[PDB]
Design a binder for these strands. Structure first.
Ligand SMILES: [Zn+2]
Ligand SMILES: [Zn+2]
Ligand SMILES: [Zn+2]
Ligand SMILES: [Zn+2]
Length: 1256
RNA sequence: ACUUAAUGUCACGGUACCCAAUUUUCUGCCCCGGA
RNA sequence: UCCGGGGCAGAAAAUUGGACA
């Protein structure tokens, strides 16, 4: 009469600490522990315990089982009506039974008059224990009628004691409102394992065989026990790893202090994130050394992977360490190294019923994420690792979907389906029987684990202070995300009288068909489009409970093989299971057509990009063979076809950027983004996008790229470099590069994207969104980074038709002048040349006073202030002399290295074979001119450089001789110089944004006969500038800015090709294509939020007037690169809540702008003695502008036959190209005698000074 | 035993959720001396 | 006293703050 009962699980269950009820009544946090298994300590300490299950719980479950089984057959066994029950009374005759218990107990109506009485006891009460020697709370004997010994754990390696951290893990659970999204509270819980500790053993004894068939059959029926499924079955009869966690600590220290020796402490954090990101690639990168080896020799290497530690290269120490500890595995290796480095850096800084089954597959049509607390939550009682959040993970690194979240989301959607929502109550004494609760307590779910087991992906998110459009400090964090395209199994049970049509509603709503994308919104962070799911291969089954109960038991409820059902053939089904017809499909279901479907409405559209596009992701760049600095973002996706990551990634733009763009747009428009009372900001932005109080009402997604294959080379190298405003050469450590996507004005990129709206918007709210969309289509907000220099502009929008008609209407309804200035610089009358001979100097210097005007106040970017203007300008760029702009991406474009090794060749800057000028160069040119005009601060100047006259060393560096007032404008408090104020600086984004230049009208290539490519040139020799000759000795000072001259001295080289190629070594010449005269490029600037006279001065600077021109391009001092700019069209629009739209401006208004700007500079001069009156402006009254214009003055434009001779001096008189008898060389010009130093300085600071006879 | 009480366990009664543009600044440029 | 040669190849700041009594 002994029955050994074995228990089994199929899903991770829960555990809680043990207590006596005498003590348990106190610790309220143990109260929930009345249904979970028990875990007891042992050995007067921690970590050594035992696990069991209280027999009482098994008893209660068997009771509920017998109750249901009897309710089904209308209350009889084999036709024997039995007793209606006895419980719910137990009053005042003894102790109220421990575990006072309440729920809708049920009693069928019966006929018999015996209650399983003493002499004749129907099996039910014998099973209860009513007629025995039982005793309420006394257990003196093992004298019971039917006994339940408690169930304890089964373990094969029990020779050692179970450790708590081995079979337990902490987790947090919470609860959210029906509306407002937010959470209200949270409790803690312990989850077990179900793979290795899932068997539980017990023991049961009986006394009277008479009641067996009831119990032995009612056993298999029960399903839940301790919070999961089960199958009760009657049974017939490596410590170094830990040391590793410490030992690697040691090694970490060595790496740190060495970096401290070279004054490189901040790069530690970069190294940490990079070595973490190394997690995806695999071991190969170390064992074959695919690390981004440095540039060409440089006698150095990568600025990171080649630092020296203890006299060794880092990229070798890494291989050594991996060889040391290779038992752990690549994954934990990298993770531990990252954590250790993070911590060290942080320390250093400081009426019948039936059962319906649903099987099927879940798919995730977007990147998903479920969040958990943090690492370092050991099970018993500011260590924040370098991952501010984490995805959940299983034991073997697999993605899980815990039944908690599935249950919750199912409830929320069902609650919408009905229409009435009971906000859940805690610990009540009655049951809120609104229908939603009635359904919600009849369903059962199951967890889910995928097959993919690779590490996740990382993303970053920053904030942006709308004050100055800058990275808002103290806000930079990163989240983890799972791959898109994974698939889980999904199981949903139901038991009752009639399949509620609203359950069918929600299932259909989660379904996906040919033209219907599902919208199941599992998981958190559903605000920015993470978590959307869909269903596939739904196959609903149903039982017949009323007359096939033995067929249900014999298959143990078909629990534990829920995978077989999805794929088996209809014929091999187990007897008693039948496919479900009458599945109403999306048509008759009234709630779905009525309450669900209009929940979310989608908008879908494609942006069209017409320029290079770049979303900087600097971290990935450090682990790629490109040796670059910035790369386009990359997403990776699963593919259900091949069960592996797709071999080729996909470029995109992250959703959060989408969201930020719309947010800033609407905010800046309504003028609500600047107020600080935003926790309760009652303006419309807080209603739409949602502050912390309520949820949000817009959901974005990722911008994907589809027009990708048509391009043959997606990513095009580009280089950029600063220039010392004092010597027109490259500053030190200031030559970098980017590698963005290719985007042309003719073959534009194509990006597709979507975003959802929750039903309930009220009229004008739609108007705001539509306005912002039209505003993007106008082209004010650039996608990506580096806006001001052209990257990432937009050029149109094509709203797809399958949208709300309201949007189509609201969006579609909303969509010869400027001659030259004629300044007549008056610097004329033959330049005193007399046509005979005057060898001038290639470049000259310019002095610009000392005082600088500054403004403490700053104009913000909060909103389009009404008193200021904003618009765009179009322009055409016309060339005057052969031009050159090399393309540094290629080094053998002209195939010339096949004969003369080491000889560089280039070809003109081009994109998909469409000539084009990079804009940043135009930005630099305009900026130099504007600064020099307005007497700004030196933007980019190398202070740390010492010279030695010839040994006279420099007592102080260059920055010492230069006045302090002219040093770079550094801090926001001190104020900003007018130059830096307009174009911006490190902490204030500029307000003027240029753009690339397009190509136009004809004759193009200066054709030469002798040269092999017939259109290329071989430039002369070029050497570095020498600030020494400009500063003769110690007492000298920085003269000023540098400028190059205009002359037709290039054609000389156009006839010495054959000779130049002879004498000069091919290691120092460069050959490239050239563009001739007579070409015009398209060009345009866009400005927003300017003051009044600033725009006037900018316009004056774009075109100084007739007879004047800028300089640009490689090879300035020889004469290549004279350029003249005109204006064609101006647009200004004072955008605001008013209906004022884009309007033109006629001529004679720009006159007012320029005139007012002129007076502002008049005032800044402070010497009011200058003429004051009303007349067409005359620029050549203020001293320094006079010189500035005297410098850049095309002589040969007006008088077509007045050209001077400009050239550098030969070296030493018997130098190579020494003009005989000229006496135009050093050692007769640089000697202190025959030329006092002050006279040299004076000759360098008076433009257009005769130099061969050396007058003035 | 450590480890339960017996004519009365809705904890499958509770989603770790809300909110936050990887961005701001920078012309692919160029002459006189070294032991 | 004799006779010629390339350099720069990334620099600075931000690495988490609030919430749910
Ligand atoms: Zn009875
Ligand atoms: Zn309710
Ligand atoms: Zn608000
Ligand atoms: Zn400044």
């Amino acid at each position: 009469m002994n029955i050994t009962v074995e228990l089994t699980f199929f899903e991770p269950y829960r555990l809680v600490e043990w207590f006596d009820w005498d003590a348990r009544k106190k610790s309220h946090s143990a109260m929930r522990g009345q249904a979970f298994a028990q875990w007891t300590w042992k050995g007067k300490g921690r970590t050594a315990g035992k696990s069991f299950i209280t027999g009482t719980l098994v008893r209660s479950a068997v009771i509920k089982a017998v109750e249901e089984l009897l309710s089904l057959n209308n209350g009889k066994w084999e036709g024997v009506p039995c007793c209606n029950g006895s419980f719910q009374t137990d009053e005042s005759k003894g102790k109220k039974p421990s575990f006072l218990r309440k729920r809708h107990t049920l009693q069928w109506q019966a006929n018999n008059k015996n209650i399983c009485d003493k002499e004749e006891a129907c099996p039910f009460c014998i099973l209860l224990g009513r007629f025995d020697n039982a005793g309420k709370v006394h257990e003196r004997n093992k004298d019971y009628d039917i006994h339940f010994s408690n169930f304890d754990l089964d373990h094969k390696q029990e020779k050692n004691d179970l450790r708590l951290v081995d079979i337990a893990s902490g987790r947090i659970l919470n609860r959210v409102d029906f509306d407002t999204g937010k959470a209200k509270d949270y409790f803690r819980t312990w989850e077990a394992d179900y793979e290795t500790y899932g068997t539980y053993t017990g023991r049961i004894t009986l006394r009277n065989e008479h009641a067996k068939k009831l119990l032995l059959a009612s056993l298999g029926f029960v399903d839940k026990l301790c919070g999961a499924l089960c199958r009760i079955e009657v049974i017939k009869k490596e410590v170094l790893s830990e040391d590793h966690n410490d030992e690697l600590r040691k090694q970490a220290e060595v790496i740190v202090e060495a970096f401290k020796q070279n004054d490189k402490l901040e790069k530690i954090r970069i190294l940490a994130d990079a070595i973490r990101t190394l997690r995806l690639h695999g071991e190969g990168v170390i064992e074959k050394d695919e690390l981004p080896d440095g540039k060409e020799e440089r006698d150095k290497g990568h600025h990171l992977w080649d630092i020296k530690v203890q006299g060794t290269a880092l990229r070798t120490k890494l291989k050594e360490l991996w060889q040391s500890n290779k038992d752990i595995g690549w994954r934990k290796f990298t993770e531990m190294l990252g954590s250790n480095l993070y911590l060290i850096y942080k320390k250093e800084t400081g009426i019948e019923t039936k059962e319906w089954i649903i099987v099927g597959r879940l798919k995730a049509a977007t990147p998903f994420y479920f969040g958990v607390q943090q690492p370092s939550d050991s099970i018993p009682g500011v260590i924040n690792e370098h991952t501010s959040f984490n995805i959940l993970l299983d034991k073997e690194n697999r993605y899980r979907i815990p039944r908690s979240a599935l249950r919750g989301a199912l409830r929320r959607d069902l609650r919408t389906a009905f229409g009435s929502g009971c906000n859940v109550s805690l610990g009540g004494q009655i049951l809120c029987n609104c229908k939603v609760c009635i359904e919600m307590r009849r369903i059962t779910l199951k967890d889910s684990v995928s097959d993919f087991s690779e590490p996740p992906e990382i993303r970053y998110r920053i904030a942006k202070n709308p004050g100055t459009a800058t990275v808002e400090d103290g806000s930079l964090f990163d989240i983890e995300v799972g791959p898109e395209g994974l698939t889980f199994p999904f199981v949903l049970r139901y038991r009752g009288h009639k399949f509620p049509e609203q359950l069918s509603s929600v299932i259909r709503y989660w379904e996906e068909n040919d033209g219907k994308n599902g919208m199941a919104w599992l998981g958190g962070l559903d605000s920015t489009g993470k978590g959307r799911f869909a269903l596939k291969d739904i196959k609903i089954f149903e039982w017949d409970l009323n007359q096939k109960i033995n067929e249900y038991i014999k298959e143990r409820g078909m629990r534990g093989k829920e995978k077989e059902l999805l794929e088996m053939g209809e014929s091999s089904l187990p007897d008693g299971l039948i496919p479900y017809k009458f599945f109403e499909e999306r048509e008759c279901l009234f709630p779905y057509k009525e309450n669900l479907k209009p929940q979310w409405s989608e908008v879908q559209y494609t942006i069209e990009v017409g320029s290079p596009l770049l979303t900087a992701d600097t971290i990935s760049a450090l682990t790629e063979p490109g040796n670059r600095d910035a790369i386009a973002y990359k997403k990776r996706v699963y593919n259900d076809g091949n069960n592996a990551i797709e071999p080729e990634p996909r470029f995109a733009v992250k959703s959060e950027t989408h969201r930020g763009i719309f947010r800033t747009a609407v905010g800046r428009r309504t003028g609500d983004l600047g107020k600080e009372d935003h926790e309760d900001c009652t303006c419309d932005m807080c209603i739409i996008f949602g502050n912390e109080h309520e949820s949000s009402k817009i959901r974005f997604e990722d911008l994907e790229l589809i027009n990708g294959n048509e391009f043959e080379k997606l990513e095009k190298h580009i280089d950029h470099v600063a220039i010392d405003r004092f010597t027109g050469g490259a500053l030190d450590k200031a030559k970098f590069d980017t590698y963005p996507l290719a985007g042309s004005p003719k073959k534009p990129l194509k990006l597709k994207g979507r975003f959802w709206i929750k039903k309930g918007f009220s009229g004008d709210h739609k108007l705001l969104i539509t306005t912002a969309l039209s505003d993007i289509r106008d082209g004010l907000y650039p996608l990506g980074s580096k806006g001001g220099v052209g990257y990432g502009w937009v050029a149109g929008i094509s709203i797809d038709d399958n949208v709300p008609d309201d949007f189509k209407e609201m969006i579609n309804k909303t969509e010869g002048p400027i001659n030259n200035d004629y300044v007549h610089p008056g610097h004329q009358s033959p330049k005193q040349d007399h046509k005979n001979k005057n060898i001038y100097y290639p470049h000259y210097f310019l002095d610009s006073g000392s005082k600088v005007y500054r403004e403490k106040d700053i104009i913000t970017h909060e909103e389009f202030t009404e008193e200021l203007l904003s618009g765009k300008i179009n322009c055409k760029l016309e060339t005057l002399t052969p031009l050159i702009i090399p393309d540094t991406s290629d080094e053998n474009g002209l195939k010339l290295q096949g004969n003369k090794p080491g000889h560089k060749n280039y070809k003109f800057f081009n994109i998909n074979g469409e000539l084009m000028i990079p804009g940043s160069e135009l930005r630099g040119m305009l900026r130099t001119h504007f600064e020099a005009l307005t007497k700004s601060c030196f933007a980019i100047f190398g202070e740390d450089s010492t010279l030695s006259w010839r040994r006279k060393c420099a007592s102080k560096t260059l920055g010492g001789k230069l006045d302090k007032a002219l040093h770079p404008c550094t801090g926001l408090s001190d104020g900003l110089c007018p130059g830096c104020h307009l174009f911006g600086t490190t902490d204030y984004k500029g307000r003027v944004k240029f753009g690339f230049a397009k190509y136009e009208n004809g004759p193009e290539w200066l054709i030469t006969r002798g040269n092999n490519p017939e259109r290329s040139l071989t430039l002369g020799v070029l050497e570095s500038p020498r600030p020494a000759f400009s500063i003769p000795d110690d007492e000298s000072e920085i003269p000023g800015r540098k400028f190059y001259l205009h002359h037709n001295g290039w054609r000389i080289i156009r006839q010495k090709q054959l000779e130049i190629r002879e004498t000069v070594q091919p290691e120092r010449n460069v050959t490239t294509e050239v563009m001739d005269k007579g070409n015009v490029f398209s060009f345009d600037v866009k400005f927003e939020n300017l003051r009044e006279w600033e725009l006037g001065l900018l316009l004056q600077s774009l075109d100084p007037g007739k007879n004047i021109a800028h300089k640009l391009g490689k090879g300035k001092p020889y004469g290549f690169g004279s350029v003249k700019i005109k204006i064609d069209s101006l647009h200004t629009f004072k955008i605001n809540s008013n209906n004022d739209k884009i309007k033109r401006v006629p001529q004679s208004d720009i006159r007012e702008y320029i005139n007012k700007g002129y007076q502002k500079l008049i005032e800044w001069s402070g010497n009011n003695s200058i003429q004051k009156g009303n007349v067409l402006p005359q620029w050549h009254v203020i001293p320094h502008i006079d010189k500035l214009y005297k410098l850049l003055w095309v002589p040969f434009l007006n008088d077509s036959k007045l050209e001077p001779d400009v050239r550098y001096p030969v070296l030493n008189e018997e130098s190579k190209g020494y003009i005989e008898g000229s006496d135009y060389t050093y050692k007769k010009l640089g000697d202190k005698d025959n030329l006092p130093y002050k006279t040299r300085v004076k000759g360098l600071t008076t433009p257009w000074s005769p130099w061969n006879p050396f007058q003035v």
